[PDB]
Design a protein around this ligand. Sequence first.
Ligand SMILES: CCOP(=O)(COc1ccc(C[C@H](NC(=O)O[C@H]2CO[C@H]3OCC[C@H]32)[C@H](O)CN(CC(C)C)S(=O)(=O)c2ccc3c(c2)OCO3)cc1)OCC
Lengths: 99, 99
Amino acid sequence: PQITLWKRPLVTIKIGGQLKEALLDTGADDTVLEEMNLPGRWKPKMIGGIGGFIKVRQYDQILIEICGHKAIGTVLVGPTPVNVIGRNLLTQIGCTLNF
Amino acid sequence: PQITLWKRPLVTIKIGGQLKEALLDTGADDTVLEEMNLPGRWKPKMIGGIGGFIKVRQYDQILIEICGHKAIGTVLVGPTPVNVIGRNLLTQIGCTLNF
Ligand SMILES: CCOP(=O)(COc1ccc(C[C@H](NC(=O)O[C@H]2CO[C@H]3OCC[C@H]32)[C@H](O)CN(CC(C)C)S(=O)(=O)c2ccc3c(c2)OCO3)cc1)OCC
């Protein structure tokens, strides 16, 4: 679909079998979700944002459905202010910016 | 144009008579730019993201040209690690997400 930007581009995602709300974020290299339980091994990682660095759990090769479109990729779980879908998954569902 | 997301969506902007590079960022409510002397009055503000908050100066009705398209709105100036064009200006140049 075509999504305008007068409101936040929030969409429903499905991950670990559960539905959540997330923000489509072209300024994020990576996908970062709020604290949750996910099945699968994970390794400690650090990621930096506007305010500094946070500690996250890196889950690799995670299945995630974004507005019905399937992606399989890296998901970081940690103290982010909002669930963000980054370019690592936006590219898998074929997202582009147009103006 | 159409901008794919394999790499960061970096574009040239013109603001305050100077050229800079900035990210087209659908996850940013507001536009945040590196420290620069803009003439005029401003108001202090705090904006937050991953890692916490930074202190910025809010300027209103600022002229920015983005890849040939003109926009006018609020610009936040401060010690940000990256320049982001947020939704307040992206809506003005008719930018949409498409997948
Ligand atoms: C030079 C490198 O420095 P750096 O590595 C980090 O640089 C940065 C690079 C890009 C961005 C843009 C930010 N992306 C992001 O956080 O992505 C991370 C996950 O993927 C990674 O890729 C990029 C960083 C990692 C989002 O798009 C927008 N954000 C809001 C989202 C809801 C979170 S926002 O900026 O907080 C913000 C903008 C305007 C606002 C506002 C909040 O509120 C009102 O208006 C920030 C910092 O180290 C830091 C010490």
